[PDB]
Symmetry: D3
Subunit: 335 residues, 6 copies
Amino acid sequence: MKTQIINGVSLPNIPWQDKPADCKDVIWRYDANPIIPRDQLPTSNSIFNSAVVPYESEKGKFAGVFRVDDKCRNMELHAGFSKDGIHWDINPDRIVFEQAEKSTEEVNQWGYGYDPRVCFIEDRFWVTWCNAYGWKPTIGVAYTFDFKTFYQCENAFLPFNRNGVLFPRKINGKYVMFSRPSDSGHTPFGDMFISQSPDMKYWGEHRHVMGPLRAWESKKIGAGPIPIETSEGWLCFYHGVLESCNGFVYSFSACILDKDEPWKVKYRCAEYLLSPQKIYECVGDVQNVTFPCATLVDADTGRIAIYYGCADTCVSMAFTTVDDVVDYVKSHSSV
Amino acid sequence: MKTQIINGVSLPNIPWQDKPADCKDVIWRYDANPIIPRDQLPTSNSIFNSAVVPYESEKGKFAGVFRVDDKCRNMELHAGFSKDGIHWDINPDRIVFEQAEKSTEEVNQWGYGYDPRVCFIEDRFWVTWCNAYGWKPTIGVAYTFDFKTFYQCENAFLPFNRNGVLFPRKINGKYVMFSRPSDSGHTPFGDMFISQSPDMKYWGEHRHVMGPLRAWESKKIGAGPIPIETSEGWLCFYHGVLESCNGFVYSFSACILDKDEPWKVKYRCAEYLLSPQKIYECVGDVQNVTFPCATLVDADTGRIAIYYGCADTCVSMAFTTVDDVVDYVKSHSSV
Amino acid sequence: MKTQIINGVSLPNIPWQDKPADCKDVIWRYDANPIIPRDQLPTSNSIFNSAVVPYESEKGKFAGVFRVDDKCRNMELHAGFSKDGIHWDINPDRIVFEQAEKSTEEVNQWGYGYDPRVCFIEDRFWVTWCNAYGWKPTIGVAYTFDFKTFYQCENAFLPFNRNGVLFPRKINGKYVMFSRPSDSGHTPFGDMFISQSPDMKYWGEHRHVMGPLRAWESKKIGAGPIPIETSEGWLCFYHGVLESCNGFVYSFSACILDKDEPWKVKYRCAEYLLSPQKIYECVGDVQNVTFPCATLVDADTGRIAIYYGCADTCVSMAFTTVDDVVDYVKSHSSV
Amino acid sequence: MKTQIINGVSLPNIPWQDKPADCKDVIWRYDANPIIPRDQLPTSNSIFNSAVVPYESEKGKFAGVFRVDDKCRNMELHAGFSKDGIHWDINPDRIVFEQAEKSTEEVNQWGYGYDPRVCFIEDRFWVTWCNAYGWKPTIGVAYTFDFKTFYQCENAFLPFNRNGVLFPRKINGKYVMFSRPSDSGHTPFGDMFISQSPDMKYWGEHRHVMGPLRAWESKKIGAGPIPIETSEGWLCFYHGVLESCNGFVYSFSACILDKDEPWKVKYRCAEYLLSPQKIYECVGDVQNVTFPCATLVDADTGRIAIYYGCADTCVSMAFTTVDDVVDYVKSHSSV
Amino acid sequence: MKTQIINGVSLPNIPWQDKPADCKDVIWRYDANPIIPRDQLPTSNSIFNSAVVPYESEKGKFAGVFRVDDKCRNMELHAGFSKDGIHWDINPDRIVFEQAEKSTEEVNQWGYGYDPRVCFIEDRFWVTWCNAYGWKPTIGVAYTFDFKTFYQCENAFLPFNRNGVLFPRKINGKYVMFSRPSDSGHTPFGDMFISQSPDMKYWGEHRHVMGPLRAWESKKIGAGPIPIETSEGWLCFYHGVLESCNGFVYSFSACILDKDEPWKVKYRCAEYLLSPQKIYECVGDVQNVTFPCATLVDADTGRIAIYYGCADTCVSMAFTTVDDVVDYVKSHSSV
Amino acid sequence: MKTQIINGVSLPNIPWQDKPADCKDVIWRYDANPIIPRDQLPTSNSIFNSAVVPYESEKGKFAGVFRVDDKCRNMELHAGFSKDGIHWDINPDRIVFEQAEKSTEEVNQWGYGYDPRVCFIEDRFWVTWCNAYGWKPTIGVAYTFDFKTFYQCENAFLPFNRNGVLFPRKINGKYVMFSRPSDSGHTPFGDMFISQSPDMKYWGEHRHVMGPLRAWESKKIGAGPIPIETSEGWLCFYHGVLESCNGFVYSFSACILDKDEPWKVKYRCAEYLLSPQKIYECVGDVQNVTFPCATLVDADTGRIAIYYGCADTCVSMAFTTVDDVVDYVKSHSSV
């Protein structure tokens, strides 16, 4: 492989399909999407925008935290497990957080939770999600050792904020998180930022990453899945939005960020890499949405399994390789 | 049956399919939806949101008033008839009202009409619909004995108002109608109210029923079909709206209102009972709409057939029972 | 006088100043405006848009219901009295309504109230105002014999409505009220309607009066003071709104309506008769507001004394005659 | 035929399918739509709203200019060629314009271009499109002899303008062009205009054609394909927009314009002639759009083949005849 | 003087006051503003944004075209005359236009007109203003020889457009006009353009001049008075808008455009030269507006008298010199 | 004094004027407002919303940071000095920040700054303001020892945020700062929050304080001057906004927060304590604004001198006492 994975893991059992002969694109979709349908739970209206990591357990080789909206259209998080990373066993009830410290008992009342991202750091799995604080969106933080008990920490930021995604390790001795300042409604703007923390409680040294640039990403952008560490820097899949007369179209692509200062962009692909085109992407609760929240990387082969939400209804998968994405990113670089 | 139907009628011939074994919902769809396609009339752009009652005719056992939108996209009411309540013979031409009284000859000019509701009271069938008075939406009122001639009455209210639905008997000596104060466009709000009339002309004693509450019904709500009288009080299906970044999603559910003072809520289901999920509910003139304007009830068995507009394009059917709805309403109740 | 006053009163004591020689306008202002300053009460933020009638009491020859906004910016009604019609003794505290019938003890909770209109009809003074019902604007209704105790009746209408104004007698056996269908915010529209009632409780036979026409009244219109009965028909001052890039401009003018069917317009003045031009009309809590809620008419001479809110801050007076207004409306008429 | 085609061309090779026996419409759809899928090019996100004329070359009997949106969602024009008018060989790469005079070398920088219209005038093919001038939409103007080299002229008008369409000959000594004053975003208004030029550089004598009228066209209208010259006058297919709560629905119909003063409407069909109803018209990048930019007319038979955009995603075809349309337009005329 | 006036006139009688010793600004105000009060006509609501030129007649040495809004708030143009350029004799009645050619008898029906600009070219005075075409704003054109009879020509452009200002001579043998593409309401955007015409009927070769830039001019800009020809190029006073939470603030400044191609900016002052600060500029029908439509320039001294609208209520005057303004524009230039 | 000032300062030379005999208010205005006019500096468009503390220097007994908007309408901070606290010597030029550490030389480029607040903490003066990071509002942080050199630190938070106000000592060993999550425009919402920091660099443990409540503060609220420590807890003046049809009205009041957990509201005055009512408050750049950013407190007497911006135009002074404010706040408390 021309581009090496750093601090990756060996995933010979990575969900995978080969790139169809007629497929002329960098990324190709799994041939039996969606892998998690809207009604997989008795109480679920939709299941989408969901986080997955390799994790060995009684129920399989992968685990995850899943955005589940019930028939009240309440937004919740459910833990889930899988042997092959495709057919998922999702807890019927929501994660009920325990507080890591007693000092956050008052403040962390449950309201809602959506769009989680999950990664392992040094000794545990960290969950971020869009958490309600007094019914306002900010970034929630929790950790878990076993995806059974979840320990909630302080919300990282003030509202209004969304798309909080942790880098998978400390950089220069500091935890680093993508976020994306927003508002109280259907946010019509959006630049990506990073913020830094020595202890995962106090955040600062905020740095602007990038903002809306090309047409497909002209209205707003946001961080997708956990950054992938690479010979070239941080490989970051991200979402971008185009505004039509009828609403929003959510596509995603990728950029490469400087290894030591992730807010500096080395390359940024000028094209989307996947956009709403199939029936399950264009038809649902929210039309024309493809929203990546997790990837699996096999460091041995550089194969990538991408999980993305479709039309805010279901979860689908797609495949590509680190070499293929990096190559295309660099060969079609914006600015 | 645990809950009794009060002042109901015997309908052994009610359109009916049994609940499938795989089905985990309170309400299940007719397996051959839609029952009325958009192009059933030579001039129809769409047929939806329509009123249906038992009525013994030369042309069948059921009659109705149908919202028909033509290829001007004008909005009109058409009388229809059916033997089985599933296959309909809809008049090719619109209802042309006659004024019940001379005193409305000048006032009631025909501009538009949509979303009729119809029920029998005492000696005749009463029709309500969203009626244009100087191209502003209010509640039109009319009656008929035969679904051949329609006698138009005074508009019940000042604009701007929509979703006028009559209770099917007097209550404490007065006619009672649901309505839903609106504005001059795509109304971004809406609470259910009742008004009271001794004579079907003068209205007053306005009482607030309820407003938006759960996420699925957070933008606005409004009355659906004619209220059903039960031992628990009034069973009322109603629509609720969720606003996404791309627009509105119309779902519907049910509440139970006090027998004597129906603006007082006894139970209200926190969950929708049906939401736009099939292709014909999600794709059409207005995506993501399931909109109930009529139900049939067989008082002998408690079976309910529900007619509902789909994507403002066609008319579909769903089934449930009074007991199933009531049990679920009571056990999943909001406030 | 050329135009006669019908069913008026002898008011030789009417507040008055003669038309200055250098005046060219149909309506001239009192020379020591405002007559009621924003801070006349210890708790008042502003006092404006207020109602006045001849009433003989110990505290004088005139009575009224005044809109008072307090230093919370709450909207309240205070009763008031005056010997000359110019200097006002206003109650320091809000009218606390008593329910006329027990049937409204539940429904009529006090939320807020503004823009009263008042007239004597056959045996008492009737009061209308914009009344909160569940914090939504509609028309409140009350009566009083002595301006000391106020008896609240049913709200005449559903929200959202404002500018409810009674005609000062029954017409064809029915009470008649101006109103103006509105919305839940700073309403960007507005036509005048009348509604009719046999008993001041149930309302129906709604009729359209008129809508925005000329530029000065192009955004919205609304009834002002009590209709004045005349040889020409009903003389009605109404406000109209023009929208600039910075907000609204409230002026007012007059129309003449058919005696028998007051929704039919006989004459309507193309120009405003007064608009915001003085410092106390242009600067204040809401700039450029000129808003009449009462007139006194001396039937013996045709003298009219106009009370009008200025900049939503204070109350001011202006003067004109019935013949002048009538001549000018008829000779400068729209449609 | 009852109506004759004036100044037309003999097109016995026109793409054509007969009206189905079950078709009850003026216009019927090709039965294998779309004819150009979104991904016909390796770089194409979507191909729609496209211009076609008869033109003899080595690659076929018809040529075109096609709107292609690439995977950055940039808007470009690509020339294309076809043997039958149904299977199309479109250039992989955009038209790179040459300037006709040196005088426009400075101002005509390429930004974007979409919705081209093309017609033959005396000695060459003219192209109009929506051209960026400083990223504001206006009407770009060019000509070609071979569809291989394109020569750009002066932008016809100031921004903001869209839907510029040329009449296929001079009228009263002058070139005549449809356009449609717009704004800087998703224009929520739109009337059709004509402007006149002696030389295709300077435009003047601007004339209003018509504005939104019927419901299906209530929000805005614009010109579609090249006007067809006829014994009854100019036959002009046009698009019209209705606004639902979820956005815009684009439909199209026809009108007939006076032969010598084409701003004067003679007839105007009250109904749409085609509206978004099939799955490739309702689902896509932009839901519910059918947008006609080109027709082919066989003057011998009166057969018409219509090229129209679907869902801003793909290109489709429909068929009708000059007589069928003209008769329907004249028998179902608005005003 | 350092900067010379080109093609100017000797104006020893120019209205003038010397700069106060305490004045630290480039432009100082006349000390008895307004020079034209809102009520100078018996019918006028407001008189503002008005055009003025030197012109010898029986009524004085200056003549002009004045925007008068009457008590309907209709917008009209009135002719006016002055002996001293300060006290004005304004015709009580509107200019009623005569068509230059009979070919515009039909189109040029009068709707409204405002914001006139006037300059002498070769042999007559040319008048532009914002003219209604079918109640939409565009630029009207007309000429006069004596300011008594006015000859209307073709509207120069399509709607929507405002701020049409002619250069006072041909340039490269073409008429040159500033305009400012707008929209149907209170336009929230605006760049300056020029267009070119060989005959004042057909217009083309459109060139972008400049856009909003500095904070005080961030929302939109527009041309002011007739360009003044100097040895630095064209001295062009222009208006620019800032948006606060309460509305717009209109200030004005100056730029210097290239002699040969006036769409190329040589200098552009970063600061405003005058902004709303006085009571008559800040209080009125539209608060915070200072709007220049005319200047007199005495070529032998470089004195400049500026006429400008204040709060869309009245006309005021200010003074400066060509040298003062050119030095300041250059030494405080933007880009 | 019933209430004590904790950790206060002896200020016998506090600017002061005794309450007028006819003053029926908690707070009374200085009788020669403004104390700083819009044009005190040669460059200044307006000077308002400014920060003031006691500080012994060569230029006086008080110092501060002043918001100066220049004649580009750029927003700046200027240091200033005063002998009496009423007559100010303000630097003609902006504060150019030094970076406290080189780690912020890249990130902290100057764009704009406004609404400064200043207080002493342990060994230096800390400055917060609304600081542009990539032209997005957030809270800037700096310190000074002498008001001559200012050392900039890291922005406390992500955009979008404003009204950052530091408590004047550590609480529980942490710095505590008011802020107010906003958006990218004229923010139509706003709640007060605090955030906590060990080191003035990293922030967390965010706590909701309060949001809009009473009509005068129905739209949004925000922290005003530095919190004052008191026997009753933290005395905090804050601004509140009401929205009319014409824009915003900015008033201000006071609340009392828990000494140890300042996000917990003990008392909250239901009424405003000062609103826009004088000509310098109601008329100017932004109408109807009274915005407090600094108080002086004499701990010996309880005298409070209040600095506040008026109409975004000038600075005024008001007067009150701790006991007067605390008593009124306690006896007129909201929730």
